[PDB]
Amino acid sequence: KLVRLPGLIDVHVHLREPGGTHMEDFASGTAAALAGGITMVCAMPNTRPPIIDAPALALAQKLAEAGARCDFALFLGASSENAGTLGTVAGSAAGLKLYLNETFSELRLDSVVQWMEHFETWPSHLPIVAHAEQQTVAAVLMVAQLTQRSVHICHVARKEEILLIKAAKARGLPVTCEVAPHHLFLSHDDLERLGPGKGEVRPELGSRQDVEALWENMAVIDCFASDHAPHTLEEKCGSRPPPGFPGLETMLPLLLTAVSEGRLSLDDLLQRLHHNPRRIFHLPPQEDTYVEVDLEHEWTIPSHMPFSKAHWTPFEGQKVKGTVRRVVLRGEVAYIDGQVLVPPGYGQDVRKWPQGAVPQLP
Amino acid sequence: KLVRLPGLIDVHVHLREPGGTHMEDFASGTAAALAGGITMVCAMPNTRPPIIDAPALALAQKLAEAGARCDFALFLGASSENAGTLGTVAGSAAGLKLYLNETFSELRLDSVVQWMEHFETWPSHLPIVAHAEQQTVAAVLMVAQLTQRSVHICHVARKEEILLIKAAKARGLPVTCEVAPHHLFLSHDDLERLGPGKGEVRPELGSRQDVEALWENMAVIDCFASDHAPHTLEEKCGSRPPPGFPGLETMLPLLLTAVSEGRLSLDDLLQRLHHNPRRIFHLPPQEDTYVEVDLEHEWTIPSHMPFSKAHWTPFEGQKVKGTVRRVVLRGEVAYIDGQVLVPPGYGQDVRKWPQGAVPQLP
Ligand SMILES: O=C1C[C@@H](C(=O)O)NC(=O)N1
Ligand SMILES: O=C1C[C@@H](C(=O)O)NC(=O)N1
Ligand SMILES: [Zn+2]
Ligand SMILES: [Zn+2]
Ligand SMILES: [Zn+2]
Ligand SMILES: [Zn+2]
Ligand SMILES: [Zn+2]
Ligand SMILES: [Zn+2]
Ligand SMILES: [Zn+2]
Ligand SMILES: [Zn+2]
Ligand SMILES: [Zn+2]
Ligand SMILES: [Zn+2]
Ligand SMILES: [Zn+2]
Ligand SMILES: [Zn+2]
Ligand SMILES: [Zn+2]
Ligand SMILES: [Zn+2]
């Protein structure tokens, strides 16, 4: 009694390559993706070095082509120095990512004028996504309107933010958004269990009312995306815990549990993990690609999922109903019951496929 | 300087097969589709006999497999006798079509209770589309809510209707809609030129204010679809003119003209003729399929387009900028510069592809 799903897409992951400090890399992070029923990922640019220029993108592309086990696209990151310099490589990236709240020096924008410059210079037909919390959502929406183009808001986490976006959509404004599983299945009530170190994430865990508001406003949510952000326990439990949770291996089991409980439908799930990612980012179909899941078996999330090198999870102890049994990627068995079966380098950059270019006028 | 588009989808066509009275059939109608840059069509069930039971669907499937030159899915039609009888074939159809205003005896529903019965018995995961004008839009939305499921509204044609749907979307209700080109590019102002016979269509041509309201509310429109409804001039100019316009060959040139004038973007067009049709009807990707268009050349729509056996067009005399140059369907050249190059029967029923089943829980 298995259910066949299409190849699912996670448009927001951090795979820590290039980089020398973290354990996760393209090979381990994409193994985690496959084990979570994900066959395409879009990787964020806050790596070391960050993907803020053409040489860094070229490096990252080759590392991903050699390490990735599922298909991928790579974001470019906006900086205080690169507006107007990315035109030649822009169409090879997933899109442009703006970090509008806290981030590292290289990705910090110090003025809304810098946001305007990116919206004015990035090619108008290509995706722009923003890390934009609370009032920053309204501020980036204003910049998008001043420049007459769309914006996608990453990880919406608060009642305030989803209601703002709801109001913008009611006015016909071209805004889309995504929500991460930790903002649907964790809240302040869980900070006692997690502790202040493990609980650190940006956007932070919301109140019960924030969580309730996201569920109530599911119609406003275009995509689910994990914001897979691996850090080891040594980091999360240390003196300056970095924010973020691993999430590729838990996202689909959590959401399938919600489907089984009637909190959203299977279609609602597949719009948000397949059809809307495709259409917002113009990501191409994957031929001969599907995921088989088992909805009959209940299990408890353990202290760590098998594949992510984060080697911890904030969902430990939650009971889920829903298991990824098999993934077929482009005609090859990629995952069966806890074993990944495609090697590093099987994955490809979808922006190089003929079907994966974003359409544009001449 | 050609622009590559993906395979475009028209979710609302009338191809008049099975039937003995009209000139159009699957072979000619799908030639018209290819010449308009369309590689997949969903055909409506108001044929002769109408597609209101399993034997009629089986017949229509074989006629389409033998005649179609592009890929297709076939709608089932709701009748006063078939609620609760279509479960075994439902997933093989594009969806279920309800004719809630004027139609022929066999498709006429005489009570809203019959609409409720169809919404209650048709499988909940499969598409339902309705011909629903003016207050009928609100009535079918109520039935959808009473039965806790979605509905798609065909050919929205009026300010009244698009504002109703806008209000429903603002309340989070699961409703989508489509608009046809004649309701964006023709109005009452054109009835003088067309005359009462040629001008007959359902929904009727709107006022200038209706047309303006649809453009102003483009964000509310999920899909464009032609409602290709071929009748010959002998019929349109006769004593009891049937309603409908041919439209497969004009829809894309008209919309590309609007893109060139900045009335909507290329992305706005491709969401409405590719990505949203896919996601609302769970229509599968077409491998190795694309359309090449030329945006440089201005031409005037003639008295009839080359392929549709309707052999007339209400857009005669309008100037357009945008031409379909080449269509490749599943690796084969299907159309080049006025010549269709795939024979009748090249097209396939997409609901038989592994990727073309609608996902459902066990
Ligand atoms: O904005 C971010 C980035 C991320 C990371 O660890 O890269 N982790 C977070 O919690 N928020
Ligand atoms: O509802 C319909 C059906 C159609 C036809 O000719 O089949 N033509 C129209 O104008 N309206
Ligand atoms: Zn972020
Ligand atoms: Zn994101
Ligand atoms: Zn992130
Ligand atoms: Zn870290
Ligand atoms: Zn696209
Ligand atoms: Zn099982
Ligand atoms: Zn493309
Ligand atoms: Zn109709
Ligand atoms: Zn329709
Ligand atoms: Zn129709
Ligand atoms: Zn006729
Ligand atoms: Zn689908
Ligand atoms: Zn030319
Ligand atoms: Zn399918």
PDB file of N, CA and C in Angstrom, chain A residues 1 3-4 166 170 172 219 259 266-267 270-271 275-276 278-279 282 285 287-288 295 354-355 359-362, chain B residues 1 3-4 166 170 172 219 259 266-267 270-271 275-276 278-279 282 285 287-288 295 354-355 359-362:
ATOM      1  N   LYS A   1       0.824  -1.201   0.000  1.00  0.00           N
ATOM      2  CA  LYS A   1       0.000   0.000   0.000  1.00  0.00           C
ATOM      3  C   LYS A   1       0.863   1.259   0.000  1.00  0.00           C
ATOM      4  N   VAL A   3       2.274   4.877  -1.712  1.00  0.00           N
ATOM      5  CA  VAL A   3       1.801   6.019  -2.479  1.00  0.00           C
ATOM      6  C   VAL A   3       2.960   6.561  -3.293  1.00  0.00           C
ATOM      7  N   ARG A   4       2.714   6.769  -4.580  1.00  0.00           N
ATOM      8  CA  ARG A   4       3.716   7.307  -5.486  1.00  0.00           C
ATOM      9  C   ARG A   4       3.559   8.815  -5.552  1.00  0.00           C
ATOM     10  N   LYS A 166      -0.574  37.914   3.264  1.00  0.00           N
ATOM     11  CA  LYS A 166      -1.967  37.739   2.879  1.00  0.00           C
ATOM     12  C   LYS A 166      -2.569  39.047   2.376  1.00  0.00           C
ATOM     13  N   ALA A 170      -3.894  39.988  -1.400  1.00  0.00           N
ATOM     14  CA  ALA A 170      -5.240  40.480  -1.654  1.00  0.00           C
ATOM     15  C   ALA A 170      -5.230  41.739  -2.515  1.00  0.00           C
ATOM     16  N   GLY A 172      -3.142  42.061  -4.985  1.00  0.00           N
ATOM     17  CA  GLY A 172      -2.607  41.653  -6.266  1.00  0.00           C
ATOM     18  C   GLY A 172      -1.110  41.793  -6.406  1.00  0.00           C
ATOM     19  N   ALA A 219      -3.533  28.613   2.876  1.00  0.00           N
ATOM     20  CA  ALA A 219      -3.766  29.063   1.501  1.00  0.00           C
ATOM     21  C   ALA A 219      -2.765  30.133   1.061  1.00  0.00           C
ATOM     22  N   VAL A 259      -0.926  15.242   6.952  1.00  0.00           N
ATOM     23  CA  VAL A 259      -1.903  14.801   5.965  1.00  0.00           C
ATOM     24  C   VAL A 259      -2.766  13.691   6.554  1.00  0.00           C
ATOM     25  N   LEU A 266      -3.209  15.707   0.683  1.00  0.00           N
ATOM     26  CA  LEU A 266      -2.057  15.297  -0.106  1.00  0.00           C
ATOM     27  C   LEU A 266      -1.785  16.300  -1.218  1.00  0.00           C
ATOM     28  N   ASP A 267      -2.837  16.775  -1.875  1.00  0.00           N
ATOM     29  CA  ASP A 267      -2.657  17.788  -2.902  1.00  0.00           C
ATOM     30  C   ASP A 267      -2.032  19.050  -2.325  1.00  0.00           C
ATOM     31  N   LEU A 270       1.577  18.424  -2.084  1.00  0.00           N
ATOM     32  CA  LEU A 270       2.291  18.315  -3.356  1.00  0.00           C
ATOM     33  C   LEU A 270       2.329  19.633  -4.117  1.00  0.00           C
ATOM     34  N   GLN A 271       1.333  20.510  -3.937  1.00  0.00           N
ATOM     35  CA  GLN A 271       1.498  21.850  -4.482  1.00  0.00           C
ATOM     36  C   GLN A 271       2.718  22.525  -3.870  1.00  0.00           C
ATOM     37  N   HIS A 275       4.746  21.389  -7.275  1.00  0.00           N
ATOM     38  CA  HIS A 275       4.269  22.256  -8.349  1.00  0.00           C
ATOM     39  C   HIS A 275       4.652  23.720  -8.146  1.00  0.00           C
ATOM     40  N   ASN A 276       4.505  24.249  -6.922  1.00  0.00           N
ATOM     41  CA  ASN A 276       4.816  25.666  -6.745  1.00  0.00           C
ATOM     42  C   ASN A 276       6.314  25.935  -6.774  1.00  0.00           C
ATOM     43  N   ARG A 278       8.414  24.405  -8.670  1.00  0.00           N
ATOM     44  CA  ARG A 278       8.695  24.423 -10.098  1.00  0.00           C
ATOM     45  C   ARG A 278       8.375  25.776 -10.702  1.00  0.00           C
ATOM     46  N   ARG A 279       7.193  26.306 -10.395  1.00  0.00           N
ATOM     47  CA  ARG A 279       6.689  27.471 -11.116  1.00  0.00           C
ATOM     48  C   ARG A 279       7.268  28.780 -10.630  1.00  0.00           C
ATOM     49  N   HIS A 282      11.080  28.316 -11.808  1.00  0.00           N
ATOM     50  CA  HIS A 282      11.238  27.706 -13.131  1.00  0.00           C
ATOM     51  C   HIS A 282      12.256  26.579 -13.084  1.00  0.00           C
ATOM     52  N   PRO A 285      11.205  19.750 -14.963  1.00  0.00           N
ATOM     53  CA  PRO A 285      10.843  18.387 -14.557  1.00  0.00           C
ATOM     54  C   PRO A 285      12.060  17.476 -14.511  1.00  0.00           C
ATOM     55  N   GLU A 287      12.831  13.677 -15.395  1.00  0.00           N
ATOM     56  CA  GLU A 287      12.282  12.499 -16.042  1.00  0.00           C
ATOM     57  C   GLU A 287      12.456  11.275 -15.161  1.00  0.00           C
ATOM     58  N   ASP A 288      11.494  10.359 -15.239  1.00  0.00           N
ATOM     59  CA  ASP A 288      11.618   9.037 -14.618  1.00  0.00           C
ATOM     60  C   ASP A 288      12.024   9.158 -13.149  1.00  0.00           C
ATOM     61  N   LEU A 295       2.411   5.107   4.373  1.00  0.00           N
ATOM     62  CA  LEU A 295       1.666   5.904   5.337  1.00  0.00           C
ATOM     63  C   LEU A 295       1.109   5.083   6.492  1.00  0.00           C
ATOM     64  N   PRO A 354      18.418  21.947 -20.957  1.00  0.00           N
ATOM     65  CA  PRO A 354      17.694  22.862 -21.867  1.00  0.00           C
ATOM     66  C   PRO A 354      16.378  23.354 -21.292  1.00  0.00           C
ATOM     67  N   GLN A 355      15.686  22.492 -20.554  1.00  0.00           N
ATOM     68  CA  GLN A 355      14.401  22.830 -19.960  1.00  0.00           C
ATOM     69  C   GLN A 355      14.539  23.649 -18.687  1.00  0.00           C
ATOM     70  N   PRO A 359      12.741  31.312 -18.898  1.00  0.00           N
ATOM     71  CA  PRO A 359      12.395  31.989 -20.151  1.00  0.00           C
ATOM     72  C   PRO A 359      12.573  33.494 -20.038  1.00  0.00           C
ATOM     73  N   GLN A 360      13.034  34.102 -21.125  1.00  0.00           N
ATOM     74  CA  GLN A 360      13.173  35.550 -21.173  1.00  0.00           C
ATOM     75  C   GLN A 360      12.921  36.045 -22.585  1.00  0.00           C
ATOM     76  N   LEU A 361      12.475  37.292 -22.680  1.00  0.00           N
ATOM     77  CA  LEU A 361      12.353  37.933 -23.974  1.00  0.00           C
ATOM     78  C   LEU A 361      13.743  38.218 -24.540  1.00  0.00           C
ATOM     79  N   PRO A 362      13.878  38.263 -25.872  1.00  0.00           N
ATOM     80  CA  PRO A 362      15.187  38.545 -26.474  1.00  0.00           C
ATOM     81  C   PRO A 362      15.639  39.957 -26.129  1.00  0.00           C
TER      82      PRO A 362
ATOM     83  N   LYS B   1      16.333  35.396 -33.631  1.00  0.00           N
ATOM     84  CA  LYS B   1      15.889  35.914 -32.344  1.00  0.00           C
ATOM     85  C   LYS B   1      14.590  35.247 -31.901  1.00  0.00           C
ATOM     86  N   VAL B   3      12.269  32.863 -29.266  1.00  0.00           N
ATOM     87  CA  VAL B   3      12.100  32.592 -27.847  1.00  0.00           C
ATOM     88  C   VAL B   3      11.587  31.174 -27.688  1.00  0.00           C
ATOM     89  N   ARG B   4      12.235  30.421 -26.810  1.00  0.00           N
ATOM     90  CA  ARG B   4      11.849  29.047 -26.528  1.00  0.00           C
ATOM     91  C   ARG B   4      10.902  29.037 -25.342  1.00  0.00           C
ATOM     92  N   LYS B 166     -12.120  36.778  -6.592  1.00  0.00           N
ATOM     93  CA  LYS B 166     -11.122  37.489  -5.805  1.00  0.00           C
ATOM     94  C   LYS B 166     -11.484  37.489  -4.323  1.00  0.00           C
ATOM     95  N   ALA B 170      -9.522  35.685  -1.193  1.00  0.00           N
ATOM     96  CA  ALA B 170      -9.083  36.423  -0.019  1.00  0.00           C
ATOM     97  C   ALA B 170      -9.519  35.742   1.274  1.00  0.00           C
ATOM     98  N   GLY B 172      -9.459  32.505   1.564  1.00  0.00           N
ATOM     99  CA  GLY B 172      -8.760  31.238   1.591  1.00  0.00           C
ATOM    100  C   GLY B 172      -9.508  30.083   0.971  1.00  0.00           C
ATOM    101  N   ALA B 219      -3.967  39.033 -11.476  1.00  0.00           N
ATOM    102  CA  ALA B 219      -3.448  38.195 -10.391  1.00  0.00           C
ATOM    103  C   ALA B 219      -4.452  37.128  -9.949  1.00  0.00           C
ATOM    104  N   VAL B 259       2.007  40.762 -24.264  1.00  0.00           N
ATOM    105  CA  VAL B 259       3.307  40.766 -23.603  1.00  0.00           C
ATOM    106  C   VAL B 259       4.193  41.844 -24.216  1.00  0.00           C
ATOM    107  N   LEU B 266       6.073  37.878 -19.803  1.00  0.00           N
ATOM    108  CA  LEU B 266       6.217  36.530 -20.330  1.00  0.00           C
ATOM    109  C   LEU B 266       5.966  35.499 -19.239  1.00  0.00           C
ATOM    110  N   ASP B 267       6.486  35.745 -18.043  1.00  0.00           N
ATOM    111  CA  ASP B 267       6.228  34.839 -16.936  1.00  0.00           C
ATOM    112  C   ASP B 267       4.738  34.749 -16.636  1.00  0.00           C
ATOM    113  N   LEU B 270       3.307  32.421 -19.087  1.00  0.00           N
ATOM    114  CA  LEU B 270       3.704  31.021 -18.944  1.00  0.00           C
ATOM    115  C   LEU B 270       3.162  30.389 -17.670  1.00  0.00           C
ATOM    116  N   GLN B 271       2.934  31.171 -16.608  1.00  0.00           N
ATOM    117  CA  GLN B 271       2.201  30.602 -15.486  1.00  0.00           C
ATOM    118  C   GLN B 271       0.817  30.149 -15.932  1.00  0.00           C
ATOM    119  N   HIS B 275       2.419  26.361 -16.212  1.00  0.00           N
ATOM    120  CA  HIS B 275       2.605  25.889 -14.843  1.00  0.00           C
ATOM    121  C   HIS B 275       1.287  25.693 -14.097  1.00  0.00           C
ATOM    122  N   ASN B 276       0.345  26.641 -14.216  1.00  0.00           N
ATOM    123  CA  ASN B 276      -0.891  26.479 -13.453  1.00  0.00           C
ATOM    124  C   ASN B 276      -1.788  25.396 -14.034  1.00  0.00           C
ATOM    125  N   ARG B 278      -0.736  22.649 -15.338  1.00  0.00           N
ATOM    126  CA  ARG B 278      -0.136  21.435 -14.804  1.00  0.00           C
ATOM    127  C   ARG B 278      -0.612  21.164 -13.391  1.00  0.00           C
ATOM    128  N   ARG B 279      -0.574  22.185 -12.538  1.00  0.00           N
ATOM    129  CA  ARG B 279      -0.769  21.968 -11.108  1.00  0.00           C
ATOM    130  C   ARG B 279      -2.221  21.844 -10.707  1.00  0.00           C
ATOM    131  N   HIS B 282      -3.120  18.356 -12.486  1.00  0.00           N
ATOM    132  CA  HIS B 282      -2.075  17.334 -12.384  1.00  0.00           C
ATOM    133  C   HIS B 282      -1.802  16.709 -13.742  1.00  0.00           C
ATOM    134  N   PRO B 285       4.478  16.444 -17.171  1.00  0.00           N
ATOM    135  CA  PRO B 285       5.395  17.054 -18.141  1.00  0.00           C
ATOM    136  C   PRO B 285       5.422  16.278 -19.449  1.00  0.00           C
ATOM    137  N   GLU B 287       8.175  15.295 -22.143  1.00  0.00           N
ATOM    138  CA  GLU B 287       9.606  15.277 -22.391  1.00  0.00           C
ATOM    139  C   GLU B 287       9.917  15.842 -23.766  1.00  0.00           C
ATOM    140  N   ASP B 288      11.065  16.506 -23.876  1.00  0.00           N
ATOM    141  CA  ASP B 288      11.606  16.925 -25.172  1.00  0.00           C
ATOM    142  C   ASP B 288      10.554  17.681 -25.986  1.00  0.00           C
ATOM    143  N   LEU B 295       8.851  37.086 -32.019  1.00  0.00           N
ATOM    144  CA  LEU B 295       8.147  38.255 -31.512  1.00  0.00           C
ATOM    145  C   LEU B 295       8.386  39.506 -32.344  1.00  0.00           C
ATOM    146  N   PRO B 354       2.595   7.016 -16.588  1.00  0.00           N
ATOM    147  CA  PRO B 354       2.781   6.830 -15.133  1.00  0.00           C
ATOM    148  C   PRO B 354       2.771   8.138 -14.361  1.00  0.00           C
ATOM    149  N   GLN B 355       3.322   9.190 -14.956  1.00  0.00           N
ATOM    150  CA  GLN B 355       3.395  10.497 -14.320  1.00  0.00           C
ATOM    151  C   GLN B 355       2.087  11.266 -14.404  1.00  0.00           C
ATOM    152  N   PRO B 359      -2.305  12.000  -7.910  1.00  0.00           N
ATOM    153  CA  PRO B 359      -1.955  11.317  -6.662  1.00  0.00           C
ATOM    154  C   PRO B 359      -3.155  11.199  -5.736  1.00  0.00           C
ATOM    155  N   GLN B 360      -3.234  10.073  -5.037  1.00  0.00           N
ATOM    156  CA  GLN B 360      -4.291   9.871  -4.057  1.00  0.00           C
ATOM    157  C   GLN B 360      -3.775   9.018  -2.913  1.00  0.00           C
ATOM    158  N   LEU B 361      -4.384   9.202  -1.748  1.00  0.00           N
ATOM    159  CA  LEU B 361      -4.096   8.335  -0.622  1.00  0.00           C
ATOM    160  C   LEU B 361      -4.670   6.944  -0.884  1.00  0.00           C
ATOM    161  N   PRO B 362      -4.068   5.899  -0.300  1.00  0.00           N
ATOM    162  CA  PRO B 362      -4.583   4.540  -0.504  1.00  0.00           C
ATOM    163  C   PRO B 362      -5.973   4.399   0.102  1.00  0.00           C
TER     164      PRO B 362
END
